[PDB]
Amino acid sequence: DVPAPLTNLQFKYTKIFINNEWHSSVSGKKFPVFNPATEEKLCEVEEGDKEDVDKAVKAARQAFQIGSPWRTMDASERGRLLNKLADLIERDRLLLATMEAMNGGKLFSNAYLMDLGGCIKTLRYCAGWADKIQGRTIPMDGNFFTYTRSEPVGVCGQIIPWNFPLLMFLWKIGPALSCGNTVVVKPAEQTPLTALHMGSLIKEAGFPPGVVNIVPGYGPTAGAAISSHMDVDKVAFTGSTEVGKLIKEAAGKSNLKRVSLELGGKSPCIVFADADLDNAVEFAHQGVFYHQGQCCIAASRLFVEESIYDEFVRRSVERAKKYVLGNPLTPGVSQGPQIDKEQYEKILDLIESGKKEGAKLECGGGPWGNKGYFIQPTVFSDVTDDMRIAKEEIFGPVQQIMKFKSLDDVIKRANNTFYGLSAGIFTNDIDKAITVSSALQSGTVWVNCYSVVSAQCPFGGFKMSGNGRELGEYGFHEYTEVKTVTIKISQKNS
Amino acid sequence: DVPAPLTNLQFKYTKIFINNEWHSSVSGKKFPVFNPATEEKLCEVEEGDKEDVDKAVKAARQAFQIGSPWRTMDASERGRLLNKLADLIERDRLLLATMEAMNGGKLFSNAYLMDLGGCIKTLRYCAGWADKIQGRTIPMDGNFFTYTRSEPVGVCGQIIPWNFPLLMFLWKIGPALSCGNTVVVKPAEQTPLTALHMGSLIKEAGFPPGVVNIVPGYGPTAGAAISSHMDVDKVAFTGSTEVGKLIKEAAGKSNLKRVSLELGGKSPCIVFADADLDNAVEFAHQGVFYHQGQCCIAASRLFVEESIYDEFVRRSVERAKKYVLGNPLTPGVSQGPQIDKEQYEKILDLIESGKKEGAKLECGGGPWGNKGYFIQPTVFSDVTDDMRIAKEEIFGPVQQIMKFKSLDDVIKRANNTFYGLSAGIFTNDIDKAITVSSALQSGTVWVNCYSVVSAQCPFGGFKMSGNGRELGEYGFHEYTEVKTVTIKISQKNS
Amino acid sequence: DVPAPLTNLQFKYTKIFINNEWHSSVSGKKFPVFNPATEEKLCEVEEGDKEDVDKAVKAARQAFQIGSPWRTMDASERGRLLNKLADLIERDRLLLATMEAMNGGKLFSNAYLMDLGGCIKTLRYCAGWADKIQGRTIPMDGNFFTYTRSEPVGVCGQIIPWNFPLLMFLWKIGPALSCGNTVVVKPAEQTPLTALHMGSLIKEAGFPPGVVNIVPGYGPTAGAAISSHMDVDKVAFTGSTEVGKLIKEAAGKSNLKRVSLELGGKSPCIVFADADLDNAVEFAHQGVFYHQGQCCIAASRLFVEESIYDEFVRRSVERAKKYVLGNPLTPGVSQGPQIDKEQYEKILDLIESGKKEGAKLECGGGPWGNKGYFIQPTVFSDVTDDMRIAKEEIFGPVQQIMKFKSLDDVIKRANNTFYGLSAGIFTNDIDKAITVSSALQSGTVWVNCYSVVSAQCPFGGFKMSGNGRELGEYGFHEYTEVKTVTIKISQKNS
Amino acid sequence: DVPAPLTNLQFKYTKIFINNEWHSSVSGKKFPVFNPATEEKLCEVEEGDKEDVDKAVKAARQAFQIGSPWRTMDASERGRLLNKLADLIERDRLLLATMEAMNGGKLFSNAYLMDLGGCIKTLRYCAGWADKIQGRTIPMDGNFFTYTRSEPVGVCGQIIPWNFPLLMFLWKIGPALSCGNTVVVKPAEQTPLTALHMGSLIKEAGFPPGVVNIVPGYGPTAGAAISSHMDVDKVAFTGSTEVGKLIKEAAGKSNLKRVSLELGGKSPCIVFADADLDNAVEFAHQGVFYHQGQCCIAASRLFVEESIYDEFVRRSVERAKKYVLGNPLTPGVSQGPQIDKEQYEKILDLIESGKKEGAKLECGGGPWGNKGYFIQPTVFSDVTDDMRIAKEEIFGPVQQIMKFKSLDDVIKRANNTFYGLSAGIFTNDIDKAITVSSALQSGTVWVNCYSVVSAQCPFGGFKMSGNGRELGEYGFHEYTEVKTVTIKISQKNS
Ligand SMILES: NC(=O)C1CC=CN([C@@H]2O[C@H](COP(=O)(O)OP(=O)(O)OC[C@H]3O[C@@H](n4cnc5c(N)ncnc54)[C@H](O)[C@@H]3O)[C@@H](O)[C@H]2O)C1
Ligand SMILES: [Mg+2]
Ligand SMILES: [Mg+2]
Ligand SMILES: [Mg+2]
Ligand SMILES: [Mg+2]
């Protein structure tokens, strides 16, 4: 069941979280946080900047010192702590989901069922890895005993976006902590509030001070202080390709910190004429429209084989007209607002470009309401590869439908992008399913489905969609630093 | 046995290698290659620059296309080809070792036994991995069949230094090819010649054209074209920390290419009073003086416990006086020249700083001879942490000896550097061996030995000594890109 | 803190557990269960035999059918269930520990702290593996896509002993269930009661009917019905070497079921003259005397280097005189009874053989009290290799101390047994620690400690001490059956 | 190209091979070895029995001692030796293929291309694993450093059949030697000769004496001495299910040696109405008729969906009539003899049972020729589940074709056997491919192909088709024994 959301939320956690204590910003500045459905201020939060980040990094470094409680505790106890944290998220699920919906413009039933469910599941999966991260014993040449230690990397700076604020917060801290790292988290300026609530739960669960620090504030201030910091070992970032470039450059200029990036996409969804059409229409539809289009994996180039194209367009348009826009806390609302004015204007501008460049506007194409950042769900057909709406990540409720005839051509077109996050293929042909998935330059390839993301699966981009993977076995190994130890012995035996 | 070296070598491979053919530079320019022991010109080599790199990257890209011979080939056949390459190195061992000694200022016996032995071993280890790089099947939530592919990354730019030219060439191409990548290699301008001879063996072994391309030339021209190229998927670099910063920055500013770096060090070697002194003196001595000090892992901060410090200094000084400097092809010579004038002047300047800053000059401390870049083997004692010779990588035959009293202090001092490549510990105490090795922020930690490097071990730096690991199981996972494929099914079963 | 135990326990779960329901035996027979400290009857339990086992195996088979709730549920949900079961064990910890102490003759504080703690920890570790058991994707020759599935093996018969009844019950069901198997458990006739209580918790936690079935009763009846059953896929057994032989033969004669055995030992503990003696005395002492000697790993051959032998004997004898025998529920009692009359007589007979064969009786050597199976802690010195007490597993509070002079000789003597479960080495010498541990033919080798067993470590025997490993990563892989699936495709790419 | 076979082979290796020397049998007895196509004696070979096995096991044990050349050798050197062995097989390919064809009744082109090709590939794959078999470092609870060693198991007895004599020899020794074991091999009495030639190549390649020992002779004499030996650590066996039962029983009764078995099959091949029929007919046909039906994986229950059954039968019968029987060295012959009289009579008897039990004889059904054990290729249709030819492994050129209507029923029928080695599915449906392959209780499941076996894949049976897997990563883990070493330390850090 989905309970009724709370209303009249009273805010409590508005400060910078360092060493399990709440701090005012060093400057004393605060910044306002808004509800994108109503444009009203929810509260004000302490504005972290470089001086706040430096305090947080000193805390994280101290907590990582050899002999500290976090370095010496059993790996199994790191697991127990993560599970305790998941129990507290379950206890606080209704508050968190309400908060996430209010601050994120996110449909409440989705926040409650999907986001919060994924948050719990992600932590449970992470908890289970803690005492199963292992090194090796290695049959090296000569009279030596050699082993490796899978150590934590150290102090990990973690910068996250506004589209799945709580889920992304846990995607970052879960694996990092499971592996024994300490962290400095920088939530999006738009969406700090669930992250700050999580500070109280981290303390309550019993994590040692300085293992998680949380610095709300802006990007080129707090975020950039993290990327350039000379005592941050690793930075992990989810957001725009443009900012990912700045982060990698900053890492280079400063201390060569390790870098992982998940960056967004222009993911192709390929529907062959032999596909189950009912299934493909719905998955491709949800695949681009989910959370008002504000998903890195959005199926924002829908390639449909010529013989089924007109029918696929007709059904896709029909499907896009079935939404009720409004406050995402209101029962019956099936589409909320975009996050803020910047994203709103970016989308409208891209919609305008589609009209100007000759795409066929099938429905929507304009704003809705007299408050909040609402945009009518929009479908364009007869989209061609050179159009802005075919090239640029829109991050709004805007679907592009394109035709193809040749298998070789559609693979080429699908791969002809600097992005590489995900892709979908719809076919009943075994050979196409395997060979087309092998040929697509995308990190995750769905076959006869879309948007299926689990904690057990590694997730991340090819090309400019990202560096590294998150979650799964592979993700974890990347919050470790490998040390080889080679001991001379009188005589080795096999 | 070590055969007599060749003399009066006739050079043959002096051109840019692309698509298994030999090309003049686009500009027509050539650059001279010298013998550092004699200062005489060995030959001229085509000067590759940006336009040559662009041809090479186009060739590597074409060779990496889906359906190409290199992509479709059995993994086991990639392994066979690598072993065939090692057989050809075996056949050409005397030529390659002679050429390496002449061009690199490297003691011929060492080039023949160690460098070329390591080249062969590295390739044999790589060849064995080719058909053992596997993905996973994953028991993800819901009715899906999910698996991963460990795909090659793609086109890999590989930039290498002058100290172990051939060995570094094969450390790069071996793992990359084992995993199915295609490569563009940029040898150091000082030492292109053994790499160019390898082009002929790569063609002879039967690698498809475009799988290995080799562009000799300079750093800020050919190297920088690779690091900034918009169609190179990954850059791997071994060299100076200064250039590694440029490489990472260039990767960020361009196409977000994956980056691995191995960058040199200021490696501490810690000798406790309970150590076997005979063993420790020799390992520490070789650990800093090997190849005229031109090793990334040089034991360039030797920390010796107070009660044994004077005796260790005395023994280390005695040991450093047993060298015959000269041409490294000449029987009886046990120390060759530094690679070139830049390095020579850098070393002399650091020696001068030691004298100025109050270190105790125990022996050497000046140049030798009237041709070639020779420096007397030099030992400083009473070295303190703030001295230039205690902080900066010297890369010359210059040993620093420092005293300590406290275990906690020597760990702190050992770790108090931006570097983290390697370290050594000498002790008879089991507890110190394990706990001190855990506490040291170094990628490889040797216990009662030093300089022990084998293809089976991962190798690389903590902190600003590097990103990523090379060789071993962990290294090979670095030349792959993980794809997750998730297929909808009617019902899953365990 | 250790709470006071319960007294006046009222028994509830006395029946055969099949399909989450409680059954009377098919014959109607019951068997008595006793307290070994008092010889009083605790209760009667339904006596399972072949006809009961057949019902249980049919239940387990049905629960394992393709499409069943247990085969289709998410692997992550198997994990959640195991953790829920651990939560219930925590809730019921005082009852279970009291029961275990009363039925097992086991010191209550140990039952509460060690056994029950290990039970919880084992389940938490198992839970975390459930959705991390993965297969492979394999770069096979030719145009094929090949993967493997790590399936459960199926119906697993699990026969367990009386010395750690609850812990062994969870060692068996934890990994089996984590991997997706169904099970038929046969607790020791001496000690069914905690296992039956666990049936109620299994039901309460929500495991589907037939996933765990529990058949109390005797060995050659219920146990042998399991080992010979034509529809049991795998049998796992912990107990005597003699019975392990019967189980493996039965598996051969019947349906070739998979077999794993942990079988007991005659584990050597080697103390070199360079060891920390205080540490070695206590670990070797606890290593043989723990739980009245009733541990598979008992350090029942203590080899002490000649120069420290007399002192080690003196201190070991002194240590063995510090026990208070009695009811293991009574505060202050530090040694409980042996499990039953058979074991009691076996021990006394072996003690008698040590006296007859010329070992030096240092202390104990006889029974104590006028009810319950109590034996004075006994130390023999001047033990030689041919003596019964040096060869045969005693499984009582009887320590054998033996001298050695030569390193080569002591390794030979240590290895000169058909057993191979565990061993200990006490030394301050790094080289001995590594090389002696490599040379000993034992499954687990402790260095400067003994009896250290964790869920993260694989555990089992060399030679006649066992087949396979339990727990750790390696243990789990053995509750799986590997299926290779190879699909023809038009063209493979790397 | 296939060269002409040799004729008039002169035999040289006819003795028992122990410690790299050739021994007469202890008894002095010899046994004759025949050509099954001509019934003529090729040569006589020393008849090994229990006393010969005992000499061989003593040699293998000595070679496995700590400090021996085989135990102390670098793992990478074991790999080099294996590759050298494969080089010698390459050199001796024509001799070995000719000898295999003559002794084994095997088509010469197949022996030269397939058997010998597979022999070489297997060894090359094995050689690559040698220095990549690794243990773990484990983050166990408490202040300990814990690691594991993946040790060899020890002395491995290896008993092999007559159908793929050389290939099975190398399937056994390759993985065992790669992992560092020593072996005692017992070739089938029908086919010792290629194995004895391998002894000469093992010595030539440079394997230390006692690492491979080879004892020709009979089963209940030499084989049973191995299975019951008190100093063989592991037995690996390929052959009849009946003998595998004896082997497992003997292991239980003696020393609890580890056991792996591959035992033959009654493998179902399921053709759905939506399959590519041309493809399915040929794969199913080869899948049962290959090597005169003498393959463990024979597709000996062909289930064809009702609507296509008559056409499939017609096409299968047409296909079975295209053979020329005769001497397998003769160009143009496409079917050779069965191995010996026992097999010949067993096949004829099963053919007779098919006729008696009402199966429809479509073609063949009787003997051919006046010398050698030839049977006409035989096809039965309208075969039902209860018939002897539907249940028992025939191991002759006899194809059974059965109809089905329901998916659920054909899975149930396919699984309704004690066997479980392999299966095939032919369909164009993605869902059926994945779900039906998940549901089939078979070790290898082929989709749209059959008989595809590669060194990179694990291979073995479910149920009474086997215990354990051979080859692939999983197989190699089967020739190791895991040791856990746990060292006390002052304080652990992550
Ligand atoms: N590929 C496959 O799986 C198959 C291959 C061959 C037949 N397969 C099946 O088995 C049947 C009989 O063939 P046989 O020839 O009798 O096999 P055996 O199993 O006897 O012979 C196999 C090996 O075991 C040795 N041996 C025999 N008796 C022994 C004993 N008591 N202790 C120890 N060892 C004994 C024997 O010397 C030979 O070395 C065939 O019709 C096939 O159905 C399947
Ligand atoms: Mg921005
Ligand atoms: Mg430079
Ligand atoms: Mg018994
Ligand atoms: Mg037989």
Side-chain angles (χ1 to χ4, degrees), chain A residues 71 76 137 141 148 493-494, chain D residues 67 71 76 137 141 148-149 494:
Chain A
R71 292 297 297 283
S76 68
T137 60
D141 287 356
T148 65
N493 290 266
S494 58
Chain D
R71 293 296 299 276
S76 66
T137 59
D141 288 356
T148 68
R149 288 175 39 85
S494 62

Side-chain angles (χ1 to χ4, degrees), chain C residues 63-243:
Chain C
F64 194 70
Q65 289 312 293
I66 288 290
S68 75
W70 186 241
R71 292 297 297 283
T72 64
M73 87 170 41
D74 293 337
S76 68
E77 177 66 15
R78 304 191 305 263
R80 285 188 303 268
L81 291 168
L82 286 166
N83 273 314
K84 182 39 68 183
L85 188 59
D87 294 344
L88 296 175
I89 292 174
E90 190 81 61
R91 176 193 69 197
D92 288 357
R93 191 180 182 149
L94 178 55
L95 172 167
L96 287 162
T98 304
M99 191 180 290
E100 195 84 317
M102 285 168 75
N103 187 16
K106 180 178 292 275
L107 296 166
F108 173 77
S109 58
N110 288 339
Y112 185 88
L113 293 171
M114 310 306 292
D115 295 63
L116 257 295
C119 286
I120 294 157
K121 285 179 182 222
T122 296
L123 281 177
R124 297 232 191 266
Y125 178 79
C126 291
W129 269 118
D131 63 353
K132 294 169 195 69
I133 298 306
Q134 301 175 329
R136 299 292 182 267
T137 60
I138 303 180
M140 79 156 290
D141 287 356
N143 283 315
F144 307 90
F145 168 47
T146 295
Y147 63 92
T148 65
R149 286 176 38 91
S150 288
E151 301 189 353
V153 186
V155 173
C156 297
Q158 305 184 308
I159 302 164
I160 58 176
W162 48 262
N163 54 335
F164 293 87
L166 189 54
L167 182 67
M168 290 294 102
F169 183 89
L170 296 160
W171 274 44
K172 291 286 183 297
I173 73 159
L177 290 184
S178 180
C179 293
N181 302 278
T182 62
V183 308
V184 177
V185 191
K186 212 300 288 180
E189 57 274 23
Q190 296 95 332
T191 56
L193 301 177
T194 55
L196 304 175
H197 185 92
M198 289 304 309
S200 77
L201 303 189
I202 287 159
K203 181 174 194 166
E204 179 171 5
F207 287 88
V211 172
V212 184
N213 311 278
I214 311 165
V215 185
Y218 294 96
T221 44
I226 291 166
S227 65
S228 63
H229 204 284
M230 298 294 295
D231 204 39
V232 166
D233 299 304
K234 172 180 162 151
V235 59
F237 170 84
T238 298
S240 64
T241 298
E242 161 189 292
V243 175

Side-chain angles (χ1 to χ4, degrees), chain C residues 265-271 296-301 303 410-411 414-415 417 419-426 436-452 459-462 465, chain D residues 483-487:
Chain C
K266 195 76 189 181
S267 304
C269 186
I270 305 168
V271 188
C296 59
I297 60 163
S300 59
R301 296 180 291 148
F303 293 94
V410 78
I411 293 171
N415 286 341
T417 172
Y419 288 122
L421 191 56
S422 65
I425 301 159
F426 292 79
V436 181
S437 64
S438 295
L440 294 175
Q441 298 163 14
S442 296
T444 297
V445 181
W446 293 288
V447 176
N448 293 330
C449 62
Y450 205 90
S451 309
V452 178
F459 181 86
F462 278 43
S465 283
Chain D
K483 177 183 287 161
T484 300
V485 181
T486 289
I487 304 184

Side-chain angles (χ1 to χ4, degrees), chain C residues 232-380:
Chain C
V232 166
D233 299 304
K234 172 180 162 151
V235 59
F237 170 84
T238 298
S240 64
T241 298
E242 161 189 292
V243 175
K245 301 180 74 186
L246 295 178
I247 288 170
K248 189 147 158 129
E249 309 162 28
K253 235 165 132 188
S254 54
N255 71 338
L256 292 170
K257 54 177 66 60
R258 291 85 174 107
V259 166
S260 64
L261 304 171
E262 192 270 270
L263 295 174
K266 195 76 189 181
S267 304
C269 186
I270 305 168
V271 188
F272 292 94
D274 60 24
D276 178 308
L277 287 216
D278 288 348
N279 182 70
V281 173
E282 186 64 18
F283 270 116
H285 172 83
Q286 293 296 335
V288 69
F289 286 100
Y290 197 76
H291 190 28
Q292 292 92 246
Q294 300 170 135
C295 297
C296 59
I297 60 163
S300 59
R301 296 180 291 148
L302 176 57
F303 293 94
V304 183
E305 194 165 355
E306 233 188 341
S307 71
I308 54 159
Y309 171 84
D310 291 335
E311 186 57 10
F312 213 97
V313 169
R314 189 189 67 72
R315 303 176 60 171
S316 295
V317 171
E318 180 179 56
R319 181 65 182 82
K321 290 174 184 170
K322 296 184 167 164
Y323 283 92
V324 175
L325 313 205
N327 191 315
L329 295 173
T330 300
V333 163
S334 52
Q335 187 186 316
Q338 317 306 134
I339 190 60
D340 68 13
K341 184 167 170 77
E342 177 191 330
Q343 297 300 112
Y344 173 86
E345 294 298 326
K346 168 172 175 221
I347 298 156
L348 289 179
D349 174 73
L350 276 153
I351 289 171
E352 282 317 289
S353 78
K355 301 180 189 172
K356 288 187 183 279
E357 291 184 327
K360 185 169 181 190
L361 179 67
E362 299 279 359
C363 59
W368 176 87
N370 50 31
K371 76 172 171 179
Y373 306 106
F374 293 95
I375 294 174
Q376 290 186 118
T378 302
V379 175
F380 284 106

Side-chain angles (χ1 to χ4, degrees), chain A residues 215-230:
Chain A
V215 185
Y218 294 96
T221 44
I226 291 166
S227 65
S228 63
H229 204 284
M230 298 294 295

Side-chain angles (χ1 to χ4, degrees), chain A residues 189 240 242-243 342-343:
Chain A
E189 57 274 23
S240 64
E242 161 189 292
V243 175
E342 177 191 330
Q343 297 300 112

Side-chain angles (χ1 to χ4, degrees), chain B residues 66-67 71-72 74 76 131 133-137 139 141-142 145 147-149 152 427-428 430 491-494, chain C residues 66-67 71-72 74 76 131 133-137 139 141-142 145 147-149 152 427-428 430 491-494:
Chain B
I66 289 289
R71 293 296 299 276
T72 59
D74 292 335
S76 66
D131 64 352
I133 299 304
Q134 301 177 146
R136 299 290 181 264
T137 59
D141 288 356
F145 169 47
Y147 62 89
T148 68
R149 288 175 39 85
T427 181
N428 75 348
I430 291 166
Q491 97 155 350
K492 143 188 94 183
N493 289 265
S494 62
Chain C
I66 288 290
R71 292 297 297 283
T72 64
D74 293 337
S76 68
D131 63 353
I133 298 306
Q134 301 175 329
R136 299 292 182 267
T137 60
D141 287 356
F145 168 47
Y147 63 92
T148 65
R149 286 176 38 91
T427 180
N428 73 349
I430 292 164
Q491 189 154 66
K492 143 189 95 184
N493 290 266
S494 58

Side-chain angles (χ1 to χ4, degrees), chain B residues 240 242-243 342:
Chain B
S240 68
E242 164 187 298
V243 176
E342 175 193 329

